[PDB]
Design a protein around this ligand. Structure first.
Ligand SMILES: [Ca+2]
Ligand SMILES: [Ca+2]
Ligand SMILES: [Ca+2]
Lengths: 129, 143
């Protein structure tokens, strides 16, 4: 793995929790990780989770929340029929997009996930190959 | 296929991209500071390894009215360790330097700067000097 990046025993993870003043939104966090050649960290098994936890330990970043690459995201007819026709007014539909939800990691031994407004300022975790 | 970052002059035939930094007289830096700045971006002070790369930079100069300005390049005098000779210039064969010697000769004093006119010529000057500067980055890479 790159310059000190949690080595999955596969994937490399790196925490980013410098200060509460430079926390980013999910989108910014994702741009930051992508500009590095990777992306926001994805957790696909217990192993990957232990790794991030060791990183949290090794750095003393207990209890901090981190953005993970978790993201959520059309209209259907109730009766089941297919949407073979549309007559939306200009710009419609549009409400189903004023808010989006993303998943954050609770940095304690439970290592649990919670979804929240993708616009919250948070620490984040990247993953490079 | 590697491509150049958010608008940086791309060397059509190589893997380098260039960007001018001429924010004005009160923004100028030293070779080392300029180097720190460029590497901080994930790049480095610009190297000119051929004519095409030189032309890419000249086109950057033109597109920004940066005519007649001076820019730092990654050009730096390295002080080859084979440089010592005797008083008449004869080469040194036998040697009896103390432990760790020689070593004062390694002090970095001279760096290269680019004259932003059509000549695109280089001049070696004291690295302490304040100049505008140019960075380069590898394609496929983002600042
Ligand atoms: Ca809850
Ligand atoms: Ca929730
Ligand atoms: Ca000179």
């Amino acid at each position: 793995c790159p310059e000190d990046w949690g080595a999955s025993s596969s994937l490399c993870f790196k925490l980013y929790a410098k200060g509460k003043h430079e926390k980013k939104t999910w989108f910014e966090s994702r741009d930051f990780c992508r500009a590095l050649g990777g992306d926001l960290a994805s957790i696909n098994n217990k192993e990957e989770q232990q790794t991030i936890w060791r990183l949290i330990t090794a750095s003393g970043s207990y209890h901090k929340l981190f953005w993970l690459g978790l993201t959520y995201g059309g209209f259907t007819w109730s009766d089941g029929s297919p949407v073979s026709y549309e007559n939306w007014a200009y710009g419609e539909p549009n409400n189903y997009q004023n808010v989006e939800y993303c998943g954050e990691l609770k940095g304690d031994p439970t290592m649990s996930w919670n979804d929240i407004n993708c616009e919250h300022l948070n620490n984040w975790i990247c993953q490079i190959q």
